[PDB]
């Protein structure tokens, strides 16, 4: 399956996460925060190591 | 780590980019739906298809 539909999907993901957080009173750098790790925690897995 | 930082570093600066928008009127899932396409269009291009 193409590595791009996937990681979409788990923006589309990131983004309700956020979303609720937002819901909740979170301040949204604190949000961010956490989720940048995430998705450098993703990239970092299923791409491979750029030049 | 300098793909990798210089990936963490961009979307740091998204964040900010995303709050600017938000202290300007706009709704984070509108500002959303444009940001997943600029984040999945910086890793198709800076990182190698995944084999």
Chains 1, 2 share one sequence.
Request: glycine letters at 4%; aromatic letters at 12%.
């Amino acid at each position: 399956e193409d590595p791009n539909l996937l990681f979409q999907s788990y923006l589309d993901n990131v983004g309700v996460q956020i979303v609720r957080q937002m819901r909740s009173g979170e301040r949204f750098l604190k949000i961010w925060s956490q989720t940048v790790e995430e998705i450098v925690s993703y990239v970092t897995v299923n791409f491979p190591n750029p030049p």
